[PDB]
Structures are given as structure tokens and as C-alpha cells.
Amino acid sequence: TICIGYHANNSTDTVDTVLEKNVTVTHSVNLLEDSHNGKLCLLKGIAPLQLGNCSVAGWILGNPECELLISKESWSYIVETPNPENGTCYPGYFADYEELREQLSSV
Amino acid sequence: IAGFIEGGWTGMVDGWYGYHHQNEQGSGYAADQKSTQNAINGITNKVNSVIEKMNTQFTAVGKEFNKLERRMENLNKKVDDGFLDIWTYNAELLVLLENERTLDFHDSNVKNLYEKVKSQLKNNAKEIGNGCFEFYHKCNNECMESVKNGTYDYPKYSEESKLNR
Amino acid sequence: IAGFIEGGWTGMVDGWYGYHHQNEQGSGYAADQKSTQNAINGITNKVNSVIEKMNTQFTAVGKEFNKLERRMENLNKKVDDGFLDIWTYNAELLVLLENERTLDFHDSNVKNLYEKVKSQLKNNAKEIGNGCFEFYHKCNNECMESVKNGTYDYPKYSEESKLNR
Amino acid sequence: IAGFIEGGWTGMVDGWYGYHHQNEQGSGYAADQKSTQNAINGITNKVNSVIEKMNTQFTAVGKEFNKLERRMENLNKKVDDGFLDIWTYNAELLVLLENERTLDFHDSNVKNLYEKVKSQLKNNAKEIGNGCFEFYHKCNNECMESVKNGTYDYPKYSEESKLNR
Amino acid sequence: QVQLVQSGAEVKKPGSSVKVSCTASGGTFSTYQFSWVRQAPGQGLEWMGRIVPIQGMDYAQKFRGRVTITADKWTSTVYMEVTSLRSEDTAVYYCATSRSMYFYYQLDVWGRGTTVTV
Amino acid sequence: QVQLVQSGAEVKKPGSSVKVSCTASGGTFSTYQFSWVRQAPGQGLEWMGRIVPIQGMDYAQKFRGRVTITADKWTSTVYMEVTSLRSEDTAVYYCATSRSMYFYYQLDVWGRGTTVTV
């Protein structure tokens, strides 16, 4: 006449616990992000400074091929490519280069 | 239609915990909205507890090092990897422990619905063992609601139940 | 005067868990000194467990860095902040988990006092549902102490209880 | 020969949980192989969970520093000691929490064996309070196996049990 | 208890979009379910859509494809953008949160509403 | 089981203060409740005060304002300082700990006591 029970559903989402794995549950929350759009976005409306083929040394010392960067005074972040080529065009040692990169990371 | 002891109900959609009945006037499912809302309040606070603790103020932007700064580079790497291993450990452990406690919480609560019913029906209903009770007295929609509300009048149906029992 | 199921007693001051009675000879409260002391022993060890784990050998006296040592300064800052975030997390989580387990521990123990009483009284007393039992037989101070001591002589009062029951 | 409520059996060697009997045909111990295997599966996964989380990719080979690199030496020392303190904390805490949960798990499971027996015997056996039941009806080896298997035919022995009860 | 705060009134020309918003306070944004309800002058209430920032979203079919509802947990703010505005969009837009329709229940906390004229 | 160890005897001139102490061993100092009890020659026992290092403290009213009882968990030692000494302060001062009067119970571990002469 009177029965006590609980909600069942058609969900296939599973969770893990210490004693058991792949337990199917009726409701859950995915707490982890695992995807990205694949693009560079504005942060709160401000574009990054993109160095193109320029290294940080190239940008700051100026480089005949980094002319497109001399007019950009503000940015949200700086984007360097994996292997920039337009750096110190006249060969030499850049003193405290790594330290300068750290200083420019707060500018 | 057996209860929680054998499995859940796909016919009950208005809460996590609840009741099912069969009587002269009809049949159906209805949620226990107070047990369900209290369970929700608990779970919501638990979800928020996880969110509040995992507050990230960490900066992972890397640093460059020279060819003669390998010891410093390796120290920096050790620090980043160590913090990552620790936080990965903490995140996974927190989720596994909370998932296990959450499932025990819900199983405890459905049992509590069952126990608060036998505490009202006492000898006026047969406990079946399939998560249900069979009233010895004839029961109508009004006594069914009374049991669900925690207001069952045991004395009122005592004589009829005794005769049938 | 209802028991643990409805709320606590402000009239009971000699322990955490205990008994209340009403009989011909008088009434009052008395603690269960063995359940209370065992609970205390457990809690004391739990408090000490927290104290023993949080052993600080850490030195936080800071370091100065030059204008050209910013990478090192930032690594040092990262290390101090990371360790602080981790230990803050561990301290808060340990306290929340232990507070929750402590409250469950105490609720379990008061329930155990209740269960060890019905296991002795059996059919010689009416279980009320308000955290108390009503003896069917007339009970004096000596049988009240006997129940509390875990020595109740069920057979001795069986005939009187049956007649009244 | 009392059950789980008073202590364990050194005469039972084929599982963690089980049954003991005394009947006309003989006596002895036999394990509940399904409750024991499920408990083992749980424990095995728990042991593996500890092993899987504590994955070491850490390199502790040290570094030398000059007389003028004391700040760096001390930072390196701080990092190694901090990670060691954290992992020592995590290893000890994980083991203590799991040992406590493991013991509760096993105590819960022996209680479940007891409860699934009274749910079958109902009024056909006297619950003693020493972790055993005394059948009112005469019981042979076949009904003993039936109870252990979860197939006890209550109605079949109801009349004999009532007369003796 | 959540105190919702809404943005000021807007006046738009046909074809433009309007973004309106509600700021939640006094609780954790991520688990509140936020509904947008509109009321045209002289009319009853109509539901437009809902956001649960940590779980997912849904819309009234009439506005599907025109109305985008999103959320930002960093500022505890829910936003709604209605595109391709028409002269019938003269309604007051209100936020409300549910008690527990993370999973099952009704709307019991309401903001004051913002008027949009087109 | 705690083994309390006490300091040696003291001889003081009137008006000076005396500091006496007990070292706890074999357990965790912070949760033991430490009482000081005095016994004048030819008299019975009298309670002076108690410290629970992780919880709080109390004193016999007769010594409130004259006797300060403190503790150091780093050396597992309880100290008592009695100021403005008078010729009646010729008692033996003992430590004792309770079984559980962190919350409720009696004194069951006693030290040997130290004699103070004034």
C-alpha cells in the first residue's frame, strides 16, 4: 500500500569513489574544463601584443623587420612564437635578457 | 512496485526521495519535498565548499634561463612540478572522498524515510521487506497523506488493524 | 521530559551522555560515566592528532633581492605563497572534516545508549518514540540502576510486565 | 559459541565473515563467501587507490652551491623540506583515515550479515542478543543452508515455530 | 538570502541588441539558477530563459536564436542579450532565482527589473 | 600514563615570589589538566588552581591576584608563581592531573611535591 523509494533516471554519467569505479548517478557536476577554442582572444576588451616573427629582444631594441610593432603602446598580454627569428640582427650578447623579459612581463 | 531496497523509481520525477501508493482511490508517486529539499541544501553547500577551497591565485607564466643557470631552471621546474603534483593529488582525493560520502548521505536519507514510517505505523501495518508497508486497516487518501506528513493517528486505526492483523 | 530525539537536557551536567528518570522514589538526571569517558578519550586523541600533525619547522624569515634578481625574487615568492596556500587548505580541510566526523560520533554514541536499553527491556517496556521507555512493571530505584549498569534482570519482571502489557 | 557482538572466531578460517551452527546433524563454521568476496574486492580497490595516488616522479638528487649562493641554497632547502613535510603529512593522514574507514567498513558488513538473517527468520527464531538466533522450529542442515543462502521459507516453518514460541 | 541588483533602463532603436544584467550577492553565484522573466506593459509575465553557471542553460522557444543568456562568476553577474530588437520589446526584464532548481524547485528571489524601450 | 617530575625545594624571604614547576612526560601536554595543591605542615590538602594549556585557566579565590599559573607546551612544563610570600607559605606544593577534566573528571596522577619554606 505505502512504499518508500528514490528517484531513478536514464543518465549514463559515472563517477568514481575509493571502493568502486564507474558508478552511474542521476545527477552530477563536471568540475573540470578540458577544451579550448584554439584562438587568441581579447582579455576584457584588450588585444595582445603579437610579436609575429620578432623576439622580445627584437621588439625592444627595434628591428628593421619589427616596424609594425613600434606604434603599439598598450596590451593585455604578449605573444611570442615558438622560434622567433627577428631578434638581435647584429650578433652579440644581450646582457640580462631573461631578467628584462621578467621586467616586461609586468608592463 | 518495490521500494529503495530493490531499486529506484523512474516514475517519480518531483524529488530525490519519496513515496508510492496503491489504494482504492488510485495510485501514483509523490516526492517527499522536505527530505529532498534538505538533501539539496546539503549537497549545494558541499558543491560550494569544493569551489570555495580551490581558489587559484597562482601564476604559472614561465621564465627563461641561461645556459649557465641550469641549477636555477631545475629548481624552478621542481617547484612547479611539485605544486602541480600536490594540487592534482588534492583535487582527485577531495572529489573521490566527497563522492563516496555523498552516496552514503543519500542512502542514509532514503533509509530515514523508511524508518520514520514504521515508527508511525507500528503494528498497524505489515513490514514486507521490499521497502514497503501493508496497512492492516483499510487506508484511504487522507491517512496516506497523514503518514507522509508525520501525523499518522495510530490509535484511530488500532482496532481495525488489530482485527485484521 | 523527552530524550535525545527531541533535544538535549540542560539539567544534566555530569557528562555528555546520560539518563533521566521519574519513579515513585523521586526523579533526576545522571550521566553515563562510561560512555562519556570513552567518548572523551576518543575526542582527546582526536585533538592531539591534529596538534601532532601540524608540526612547524618552517622558517619564514625573508630575503632581500637586487634589481636584477627579480626572477629569483619571484621564485621565492611563488614558493612561499604556494606553501601557504597548501597549508591553509590542509588546515581548513582537516578541521571541517574532523568537525563533521565528531558530530556524527557523538550522535552515534547517544543512539548506542538508547539501543543498549531496549536490548535489555525488550517487551517489559513500551518504547515511546520520544527517546524514552515506559516500564510495564512497576520499577524502583534498584531496577533503574540495574538497567543503567547493563544488568537488568528481564525474567524477574517478566510476569508483572506481561500482565500490565 | 557467541557471535560478532562478543568477539571473533578462531575456528572460522575460510573467510572474514560467516556463520556457525549447532544442529542435530553436527556443528561447525562456514564462511559467507559472497560477503567476504565483496569485502575483499572493496579492500583491494582501496589498497590500489593508495598505490595509484602516490606516484613518484620527483628527483631529489641535490645541488652544490657556492659560499656566495647561500640565499639560493636556503631556497632550495626550503623547497625540499616543504615538499617533504607536505608529502609526509599526506601519507600519514591518508593511511590513518583509510584505516579508520576500513575498520568501520568491516564492522558494518558483519552487522549486515546479522540483519539479513533476522529479516528472514522473523518470529520463527529467538534473537538472543549474543549475535545468534535460536530457531523455535526444529531446523536441519537443509534449512540452515537455506537461511545462509537468503532463501529461507518462512511460511513452511511458521506453524511449528508458532507452537513452540 | 540573495540580494539581486539590476542595471538601469535602456532605449534602443529597432534592429539593435540590448544587454541587461543582474548581480548576485550574499551567496555562491555558481549554484544559483537565474531566470529571466519579461513583462510587456499591460501584459502578464513571460519566461525567457535560465542559467545555472556550473551546470548548463535553457531558453523559451520564442527567443531561441535571438536571446543569449550567459554568466560571469568572477563578478557574480548574469547577462542577457536580446538581438534584433523590435517595437514589441518594451517589456520590463527581471531576474529571479530559484530556491533549488539546480534540480527541482520554484522562483522566490526577485530583482526590481529594468525597462527596455524600442 | 603520565609521569610528572617536580623541581627541588625553595627557601624564600617574606615579600619575594617563588616559582615552582612540573614537567609532564609520556603523553600530550596540551590536553592534560594540571592542578596545583598545597599542603601546610600539619594541615590537610588545599587546591590553588588549574591549567588546561589548550583551553583556559582558573584559581582558588584565596590566591587570586597572588598566584599566577602558566604553561609551556614546548618543554611540557607547568609553572606556578606565588607572589608576596608570607610566613604561612610553608606548604608542600604538588601537581596532579585529572583523568579527563578537560571536561568533567577527578585527579589521579600525582607528582612528589616540592617544599617551600618562608
Add this chain to the structure above:
Amino acid sequence: QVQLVQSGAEVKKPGSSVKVSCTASGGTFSTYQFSWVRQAPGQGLEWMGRIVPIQGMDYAQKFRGRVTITADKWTSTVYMEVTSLRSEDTAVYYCATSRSMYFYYQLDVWGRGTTVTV
């Protein structure tokens, strides 16, 4: 479900030792109990010994002192070395794991076996 994989066949001269092995896959190596069983041509099965990598080991008495059974959790592989080989050692050597004889039960997963000729 574990899939055991065994090494190829071996041919040895009397007095030498042979090392044979089984690789476990599809589960956690450390808690599997691995038994070695031999079968001489024309004969029945005989148990040689067992390893529980995280717990301990045992041997059939006939091979105690000749057969060493060990394990490597890093490659999930169990090894067995039989020393002082004799012409009777022409058996096929198989691995098998138990269901749960970490504590109590039988052998239900078997590998294919490797033939050793002497």
C-alpha cells in the same frame, strides 16, 4: 580482467638455470597473486610457488632452494628462475592468478604457458 602474456620457449643444458616470465595487464600488478604451475609431458599439473608483490611469497617444498620467484611492479612482470636444471625439467610452465588469494580464493586467469626443454 587480466590478460597474462608469457615469454617464448627455452632450451637448456643440465646444470644451467632458466628464467621464465609473465606480464600482467589490465589491472594493478601489486595485488594480484601469481602462481606458477608446471606440467610435465604426459603428467598432471603441479604447483611450484606464489608471489603477492605487495605482501609476500611461498614455494612448493620440492622446489624450495632451487626455484626463486620474484616480481617487478615497474614492468608488471613476474619472473621465475629454476636452477640446477635436470632432464626431468621438460614441463610447460604456466602463470595463473587467483581471484582473491591475497587472502582466500582459487586460480581463474591462466596464461598460455612456456615449454622448457632440458
Add this chain to the structure above:
Amino acid sequence: PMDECDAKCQTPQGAINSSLPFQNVHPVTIGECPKYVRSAKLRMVTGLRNIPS
């Protein structure tokens, strides 16, 4: 590549939404970002074990 999009958290592989407490996309980020965790999944139970009768 650069686009006209707007995000609260940018990783080197591209921007992410930043609505959940954790990410496994990349350890280096700029902006108001989730914690980086080397995990495949962190799914939390909020409901019941799903076993229909």
C-alpha cells in the same frame, strides 16, 4: 591565430571559458583562470546512484 573573441582566461593553446574550478588544458595561463590539474576527469556526485528497479 588571433580572432575577435573575448575571454576571461587565455592559455597558449587558445582561450577557455573559466566557469568551473579546474582545468586540464594547459599549465600556463593569463587571466582569471581555473586551477590546472593533471586529471582526466573530476566529476562530482550530486544525485543518487542510478539503479532503476
Add this chain to the structure above:
Amino acid sequence: EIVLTQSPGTLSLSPGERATVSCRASQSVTSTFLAWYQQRPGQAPRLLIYGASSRATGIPDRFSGSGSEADFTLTINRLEPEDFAVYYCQQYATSPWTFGQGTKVEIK
């Protein structure tokens, strides 16, 4: 979809008199998913009843309600000057969530 029709469009009574507001659904709806709201002119709607019958926090004993299947009613006993507002019938059982036209109560 679930369509809610309210009746009367306008109710008129003397203060102190009992009012009822009817609402009819296009389909039967489980009572757990109904709610009633009160909108005083110039104000955002306030929740009165949740589910077909439970009263919301801060709402007085004057308000109650009940119903089943497709037919639900809001009851206001001893209606006071502050209750001469528009009442709405709302259901959240399925998407889209649905509202009725609203019933106004007049003072006579």
C-alpha cells in the same frame, strides 16, 4: 506546451471577504511544479505559494492553495487592502516555463 488560463480576469470584493483564483492547465501537471505570485503595481512579483499548496517564507496565513491534475486554486481569506494586486499562476514542470494572464482583485 503547458498553457495556463486564469479565471476570472478580474475579481471584485469587499475588504475582509474571501477571494479565490482559478487556473487551468492544458495538460495535467504534478502539483509539485506549480506556484503562485503576487504582483503589486510598481513592484516585481513576490512568491506566495510554491508547489500547489506550500506557503513561502514571510507570507501570512491568509494565503493557502491546492489542486491536482490540471485544476488549481489560490485562496485568500480575509483579503486586506494590501492584497488588492494581480495574482499569477506559474508552472515549472517542463520547459518552457509557463505563466497565466493574471487575476486582478478590485476594491468594492
Add this chain to the structure above:
Amino acid sequence: EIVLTQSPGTLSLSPGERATVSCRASQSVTSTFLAWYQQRPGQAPRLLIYGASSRATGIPDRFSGSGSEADFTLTINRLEPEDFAVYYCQQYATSPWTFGQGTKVEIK
């Protein structure tokens, strides 16, 4: 030690006929520690029955068994062409673990 003797060494029957294999221990052994295996020529042994009587996963209803003390039997009903193999009696109660000679079933 625990010594297992199987009988008959060879059993012979018509397909569809019932086979039984006997095994006798040198000492009484608790039934929880017995098992039966089937070895088809050219293959590693497969587990059929664990404990004196429980059937292993993937093994059909044709197989069952029982026993007590020192005397155990394997029963194969409706023996099929794929069952004309060698059956082994094994016990794991004490070290060393022990096996019998094996019983072959022939086709006639």
C-alpha cells in the same frame, strides 16, 4: 600433506551422457578450498568450479559439483564434444597447493 587421488583415470561415455569425476583427499579439507579445472589438449587449464560447488564465470549449466570432508565429485550433465578433455582436482587450503592426476573423458 593434502594428496588428491582422482578416479577413474579414464572415463568413457556417449556424447549426451552424464559424467562424474571422483576425487579423494588424504585429509578432510574445508569445501571452500577445492576447485576443478578443465584442460583441453593443447590449452592451458580453465577454471570450472571453485570451492567444491560454485560455478566460474563463463562456464555453462552442464557443470556443477559438491562434496565434503575428503570426498568430492564433479558432475557434467549432457556432456558435449567440447567436453572430452582432462579434468583436474585442486586444493588450496594449505601449502603446498595440491593437484590430482587428472581424469580423461573418451568418446564412445
Add this chain to the structure above:
Amino acid sequence: EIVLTQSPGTLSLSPGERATVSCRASQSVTSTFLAWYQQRPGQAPRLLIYGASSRATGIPDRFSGSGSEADFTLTINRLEPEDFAVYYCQQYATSPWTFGQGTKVEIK
């Protein structure tokens, strides 16, 4: 405050004889908060009974006690040569904790 008066100041008995020590409080005190101590000359007090009646670990069956309200008694059966010491009544129910004068037992 709680004041404890002991009686007799001195008790005198033959070894093997039963001794009792009375203690009277200025107010009724719950029995859970009483204790008895034995002080042998030259030694720190030892706990005998805690609460009005529970015996302390290491203390023999010769010792027991009971009481209620303001009136409590310590009982020593078969008093032995090692028991000719001074017994104290102590209560910890309220601050300050209180002690009685002490009862000495003499050998005759």
C-alpha cells in the same frame, strides 16, 4: 562554597577491622563529583575512589564507597597495616575545588 567536613578526625581500630570515614558537604553535590584520596605519611596523595563510588585503577577490593546529596562515606574492609594513613574527601563540582581536614586511622 562547598565545604567538606570529615569525621572522625581520628579513627582507631585493630588490623583486620572495618573502617568507615564520613564526609559532609555544605550543600548537596552530585555524586559524580566526589573523590577520596589516601595519603601515607611522606607521600603524595593517591586516588582511591572517584565519583562517590568507583574504584581507581590499582586500588584493591578492600576499598569502596557511596553516598548522595551532602552525605558520603568511604569504606575500608579488612583494613591492613599499609592502610593506616590519612584519608581525604574532595569535590570538583564547582570552583574552587574543595578538600576536607582528613581522617587518620590508628593501629590498636
